[PDB]
């Protein structure tokens, strides 16, 4: 096979480019920032807001800008001096002294939340320090100040990662300003004329870079892949005031030091700013796409970098007329972020690892992550196909890693074989599952992300929900509390999942104190709905003394918040042999120890029924302390260490399930899959197209008269598939393998 | 020396009673041996043991507001069973006091009280019929119930399988007829009890919250709880005095029943004041009567002790001769010992003389000595006057090793008293525990059921257990104290500990800038602040700061609002004064050193150790604590978060500890924390034991010190004296040594 593969080229590397193009079956080449001779489709990456220092050096007040929050400084008398730049990278960020600081900045008493009157502070003429007087001693104070971004965040990251030393730093520019906007469009018009051979303009990306701010030690300081920090200017702020009827505070951006993280329950000012920016971004993206098209070229957008304000999952994205979106793939969730976008002709995955020396260094084996990423993306692709794949970075760097080079040959062949055999259509999905949160559709597959593709200690127990779902045999949608409150719950939905910690966009915050939301979900489950809550689902703090999870009644579990310690909690015996946990292997010795130690007997002020030893066997990630069964009719499936990890509760005709956390693994995907079939009273439907081995999965393509079976592990796996007729069929899959039937 | 010892006795056991009295140096006997020359204690139970009275005045039993289970409405009607979740042998809905006046039906989904016109109480079953309500909401009734079985007598019946034995019905002296009966009966009992020297009141008028469920298990307990203290009469009177009307909700408290862990509300404090005035007047009368009859009056610190408030000003005005209480551990010893307003104090030690521990094959002396050692370390810091045991002497007599053990304990209790003159050891630092309650709950923080710390509490209770026998002076202060008067200038260290939104951390008081100013200024001037768990926490006040004093202690807790900000952890300092006595684990240290620290990665911060150093039991985790800057000293920061840290703050210091279960090592850890945080490292060595399993008590007046072995194993230790000289000791099992 050949094709559906983009190769990155490099100058003075003609022979090996040609050799790798042949080896990997490349049908497009993405040129550096014999490619003509190969006669493949040509992509040129285009950088609308950088790569022209000779422009922006003449117009330095037109760089993009950001509100920055200083460290908190303690007043030891009725005065404080606050250094502006001590905690920031001075090669990236410069305080804006041009735009009246008393109009644009804010000094805040963080101990009280009060804005300090601008009459009480002065900016030092000679150093980046604000002097404050007439304030309370023993409070903490900060400045929120406008800063110019004098180094493109991503180009800077590239420089630092590659140790480019004294190579000139690229200064970014902001097309909000008419001079720069005219420059960008004029320059693009000429580039088009000067680039007759380019087939695809790969905009990498457009106008506003996601929040990416570095510190005084040259480390990342603040990151949010969705963040709008790097999008302000005196002019845009003043224009916003005229258009929206109110003036944004610096606080509306720095957000008490949260910088409007996507995890924060979204505020109207955030939504308004997104609306303001997107109208402007989309208008200008449309013009770039129209120019590309008139020049006989395709317009392709990278899902990342300067993608702020594009909103690929908001209505109207299709009207931009972008031909394609290409995105970074490191797993199934990030695959689906790209694959599910409706408004384009085709999609492309640029697989991790990027060809940079942070991964490609002597002693490291990149083929391991390479194939791990593929296994995770592969299951997602079977559920929602992407048209094309490829890689990025220095081809000469990857070329020196023969094992990885072989791994890419394997992946590329298998990608093509999957497309060829499936005809590029999605596998048949078996249940309709809706993730409910504050954002809904606009953040499809985007819940729980902070840095793209990089879940961490704080997030992985929830990101694992999406990762499991990304390659699972169900149909997944993303809905918001606004949707549910305006329209109820759609009659085709089988299961609603609500997951995350308390007081976030993902659980929903005080929306759970809205009686109409509680009524809607309760009535729907009672009628045969299924509600799966993960971590602190439906949580609303200090609304009811005795109830933290507002839907504790549904899922059978609440979290003790140290207000109800007088109330003895009684745990019913765990049911170790249950549909949901059927695929969990428990060590015989572990199960014996659990059986032998028994359950706590009631003791004053200590409740009773908790297992003295754990049953274990499931990685539930981060604990939720002191979860407990609300009554003895809930079924406990895991309740180790004196609290609950896993429970199911009958609620009228439907069911609630509680999961304390769910990091991704093949086994946990199976656990969640059993949860969805069980909670919706569809246990009967599970058998058809199931894999006996928990670490393998099946994808059924009725149209092609076909099914495949994938091994989700780097180990050999034997498995038995059950067809819809009842008959079984056996497989012996090698490491990371696939078979078709 | 003889005496300071109370012996239990029983019918037909005169011979052995005299023998053991002589062997143990007993000077008191409790329940024909009435004719021995000993002080005679008789228990008195003012609110029970008189079913002949109360069965003719059943509207005068004590009452309690009860909260039903939450019932889901699936239409505009809902029926709420009143009694399905409660023990019907203990509790009965009050049908005499107009339910529409005294009860509340609540929509828990909205918090609104359902109007009287929308509900009725079924005439024939204990069910409330609600109509005109919203489908898919949860509803509850808060109803008055008579308590028809004394809760402690009930507990003993259930625990000891007393079967068909008559249930004792309790009664409430708030009603004048019952009150008059209680006093007339006592007047007559005193007349009829000439050989009684000490009336052991067990206890007085109101039982601590103790409610059982339909399965005969405990449902709700609070050793401090005021639930079982209401009546229509008392509720109306409170309104008369305080000028506002209490709701049933002021008692049920959303299902929390006013747990001492709840940040206290004005209505709770007003109720305590209301109740305590009544209880106190009536206790004084009982004590006055005892005294007029030539008897002493002794209060049990427990059971019906609600409203006595032994740590509140004016307790001394009662004229109680003594408090006796249950010795469960060091903390519970201090609860008794520190009470200032009585003439003497008495501990009832373990084991109780009962077949549950006194059975063939068991060795009760182990528990006996465990109990003594736990109490003894506290007694050196705050002496108690007397010891003793309870239960069946005939059972203890059958265990000769146990008898020999008690002989030793009693002799040692008296020896300590004699050598020290009943004076507290010198304290080396002044430590104040700061919470919502302060002095009125001295040694009482973190308790739910007496002497029964559990998963949710032990990480904080260990603070008190550590301090209970520690060589420092401990006081309990409130936020109200600090706001009114500032921080007393003799205090060296303040400790604030507990989870967020509890009386122990303080709740929204930490958003009051005067509190923050006062504490910060005081630390900056050389004070020491030790915060444990979620100290100074205030939820949703500042987006970027959860612990309001994170700047002092150098640690905050990530609340998933600030995930965009990379957290950078400085390298841990494994060799430090604070952790100098933590047992080293060479293999753990080796693997930790070898694995190194995480390098910065986007969205993941950096600097966290890849493997844990470990070595310290911090109890329950506080997830995602992080250092606020890189100048904080991390002492333990395993598993991507912080357990132990110290931060300089002007002249003073802050220390963060995520949790502190009691142990010898952890009490040493806390002790080193106190000396270090107060810049008193140079003062640490004076009057100290090198071995953490031993403790030192200095009596500068008596020109004396002792060193005690807190374990049942031999312990060598070196004691350092004020002048820098040292002395080595080889302490036997449970031993003690005295020196000049
Ligand atoms: C898909 C996307 O936006 N990728 C960017 C990448 O370009 C950038 O170099 C990196 C910096 O940390 O962050 C993200 O991974
Ligand atoms: C000191 C005190 O009040 N002790 C009581 C005890 O009398 C009672 O039997 C028990 C019931 O659970 O509770 C407490 O332990
Ligand atoms: Mg910093
Ligand atoms: Mg061509
Ligand atoms: Mg509250
Ligand atoms: Mg119950
Ligand atoms: Mg019935
Ligand atoms: Mg009256
Ligand atoms: Mg908020
Ligand atoms: Mg070891």
Coordinates of C-alpha atoms in Angstrom, one line a residue, chain A residues 72 74 76 110-113 136-140 157 212-213 215-217 219-224 255-265 450-452 454-459 462 501-504 509-510 513 515-516 518-520 522-523 526-527 536 540-547 550 553 560-568 570 602-607 622-626 632 641-643 651, chain B residues 70 72 74 108-111 134-138 155 210-211 213-215 217-222 253-263 448-450 452-457 460 499-502 507-508 511 513-514 516-518 520-521 524-525 534 539-545 548 551 558-566 568 600-605 620-624 630 639-641 649-650:
Chain A
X72 CA 1.8 38.1 46.1
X74 CA 3.2 41.0 51.9
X76 CA 4.7 44.8 56.6
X110 CA -5.7 39.7 47.7
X111 CA -6.5 39.4 51.5
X112 CA -9.8 41.4 51.0
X113 CA -10.4 41.1 47.2
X136 CA -3.5 47.8 55.1
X137 CA -0.5 46.2 56.7
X138 CA -0.3 42.3 56.8
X139 CA -2.3 41.9 53.6
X140 CA -0.9 40.3 50.4
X157 CA 9.4 26.7 23.0
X212 CA 1.8 29.8 27.2
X213 CA 3.9 32.0 29.5
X215 CA 9.1 32.1 34.1
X216 CA 12.4 33.8 35.2
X217 CA 14.1 30.3 35.1
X219 CA 10.5 27.1 32.6
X220 CA 6.8 27.0 31.7
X221 CA 4.9 29.2 34.1
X222 CA 1.3 29.1 32.9
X223 CA -0.3 26.9 30.2
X224 CA -3.9 26.3 29.0
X255 CA -8.9 35.4 37.3
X256 CA -7.3 35.4 40.8
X257 CA -4.3 33.6 39.4
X258 CA -6.4 30.9 37.6
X259 CA -6.1 32.7 34.2
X260 CA -9.5 31.4 33.3
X261 CA -8.4 27.7 33.2
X262 CA -11.0 25.6 31.3
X263 CA -11.5 23.8 34.6
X264 CA -13.0 26.9 36.2
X265 CA -16.8 27.2 36.1
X450 CA -4.7 21.4 30.6
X451 CA -1.6 20.9 28.3
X452 CA -2.5 19.1 25.1
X454 CA -0.3 15.6 28.8
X455 CA -2.6 14.3 31.6
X456 CA -1.0 14.6 35.1
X457 CA -1.6 13.6 38.7
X458 CA -4.5 16.0 39.1
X459 CA -6.3 15.2 35.9
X462 CA -10.8 12.0 34.8
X501 CA -13.8 17.4 41.2
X502 CA -16.2 19.7 43.0
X503 CA -16.3 23.4 41.7
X504 CA -15.2 22.8 38.2
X509 CA -20.5 23.9 40.4
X510 CA -23.7 25.6 41.8
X513 CA -28.4 23.7 43.2
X515 CA -33.9 22.4 41.1
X516 CA -34.8 22.1 37.4
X518 CA -32.0 17.9 39.5
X519 CA -35.7 17.2 38.5
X520 CA -34.7 16.6 34.9
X522 CA -33.9 12.4 38.4
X523 CA -37.1 12.0 36.3
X526 CA -36.4 6.9 37.2
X527 CA -37.9 6.3 33.7
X536 CA -17.3 14.3 42.8
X540 CA -22.4 21.5 45.3
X541 CA -20.5 22.7 48.3
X542 CA -22.3 24.2 51.4
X543 CA -25.8 24.1 49.7
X544 CA -27.1 21.2 52.0
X545 CA -25.4 20.3 55.2
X546 CA -26.2 16.6 54.8
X547 CA -25.8 16.1 51.0
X550 CA -26.8 16.5 44.9
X553 CA -29.7 9.4 45.8
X560 CA -18.5 12.9 53.9
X561 CA -17.4 16.5 54.3
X562 CA -16.8 16.4 58.1
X563 CA -20.2 17.8 58.8
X564 CA -21.9 14.5 59.3
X565 CA -19.4 12.6 61.6
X566 CA -22.1 12.1 64.2
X567 CA -24.0 9.9 61.8
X568 CA -22.8 6.3 61.8
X570 CA -23.2 1.4 57.6
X602 CA -20.5 -1.6 64.5
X603 CA -18.6 0.5 66.9
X604 CA -19.7 3.8 68.5
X605 CA -19.0 6.8 66.2
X606 CA -17.3 4.5 63.6
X607 CA -20.3 2.9 61.8
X622 CA -6.8 9.5 42.9
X623 CA -8.9 8.8 46.0
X624 CA -12.1 10.5 46.9
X625 CA -11.8 10.5 50.6
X626 CA -14.7 9.3 52.8
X632 CA -27.8 -0.4 52.6
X641 CA -9.9 1.4 52.8
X642 CA -13.1 2.5 54.6
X643 CA -14.6 4.4 51.6
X651 CA -33.3 4.0 40.8
Chain B
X70 CA -35.1 11.7 52.7
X72 CA -38.3 11.2 46.9
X74 CA -42.4 11.2 42.2
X108 CA -34.3 19.3 50.9
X109 CA -33.9 20.0 47.2
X110 CA -34.7 23.7 47.6
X111 CA -34.3 24.1 51.4
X134 CA -42.8 19.3 43.6
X135 CA -42.0 16.0 41.9
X136 CA -38.4 14.8 41.9
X137 CA -37.4 16.7 45.1
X138 CA -36.4 15.0 48.4
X155 CA -26.7 0.7 75.4
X210 CA -27.0 9.0 71.6
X211 CA -29.7 7.7 69.2
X213 CA -31.6 2.9 64.6
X214 CA -34.2 0.4 63.5
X215 CA -31.6 -2.3 63.5
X217 CA -27.3 -0.1 66.1
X218 CA -26.0 3.4 67.0
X219 CA -27.4 5.9 64.5
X220 CA -26.1 9.3 65.8
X221 CA -23.6 10.0 68.6
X222 CA -21.9 13.2 69.8
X253 CA -29.0 20.9 61.4
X254 CA -29.6 19.4 58.0
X255 CA -28.8 15.9 59.3
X256 CA -25.6 16.9 61.1
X257 CA -27.3 17.4 64.5
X258 CA -24.9 20.2 65.5
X259 CA -21.8 18.0 65.6
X260 CA -19.0 19.7 67.5
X261 CA -17.1 19.6 64.2
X262 CA -19.6 22.1 62.6
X263 CA -18.5 25.7 62.8
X448 CA -17.0 12.3 68.1
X449 CA -17.5 9.3 70.4
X450 CA -15.4 9.4 73.6
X452 CA -12.8 6.3 69.8
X453 CA -10.8 8.2 67.1
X454 CA -11.6 6.8 63.6
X455 CA -10.5 7.0 59.9
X456 CA -11.8 10.6 59.6
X457 CA -10.4 11.9 62.9
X460 CA -5.9 15.2 64.0
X499 CA -10.2 19.8 57.6
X500 CA -11.8 22.7 55.8
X501 CA -15.1 24.1 57.0
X502 CA -14.9 22.7 60.5
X507 CA -14.3 28.2 58.4
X508 CA -15.1 31.7 57.0
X511 CA -11.8 35.6 55.6
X513 CA -8.9 40.4 57.7
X514 CA -8.5 41.3 61.4
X516 CA -5.3 37.3 59.3
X517 CA -3.6 40.6 60.2
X518 CA -3.3 39.6 63.9
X520 CA 0.6 37.3 60.4
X521 CA 1.9 40.3 62.5
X524 CA 6.4 38.1 61.7
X525 CA 7.4 39.3 65.3
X534 CA -6.2 22.2 55.9
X539 CA -13.3 27.7 50.4
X540 CA -14.1 30.0 47.4
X541 CA -13.0 33.2 49.1
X542 CA -9.9 33.7 46.9
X543 CA -9.6 31.8 43.6
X544 CA -5.8 31.4 44.1
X545 CA -5.4 30.8 47.8
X548 CA -5.5 31.8 53.9
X551 CA 2.2 32.5 53.0
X558 CA -4.5 23.0 44.8
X559 CA -8.4 23.1 44.4
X560 CA -8.4 22.4 40.6
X561 CA -8.8 26.2 40.0
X562 CA -5.1 26.7 39.4
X563 CA -4.0 23.8 37.3
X564 CA -2.8 26.1 34.5
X565 CA 0.0 27.3 36.9
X566 CA 3.0 25.0 36.9
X568 CA 7.8 23.9 41.1
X600 CA 9.8 20.4 34.1
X601 CA 7.2 19.1 31.7
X602 CA 4.4 21.3 30.2
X603 CA 1.3 21.4 32.5
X604 CA 3.0 19.2 35.1
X605 CA 5.4 21.6 36.9
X620 CA -5.0 10.8 55.8
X621 CA -3.7 12.4 52.7
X622 CA -4.3 16.1 51.8
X623 CA -4.3 15.9 48.0
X624 CA -2.3 18.2 45.9
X630 CA 10.9 27.8 46.0
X639 CA 3.8 11.2 45.7
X640 CA 3.5 14.6 44.0
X641 CA 2.3 16.6 47.0
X649 CA 8.3 34.4 58.0
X650 CA 10.1 37.5 59.3

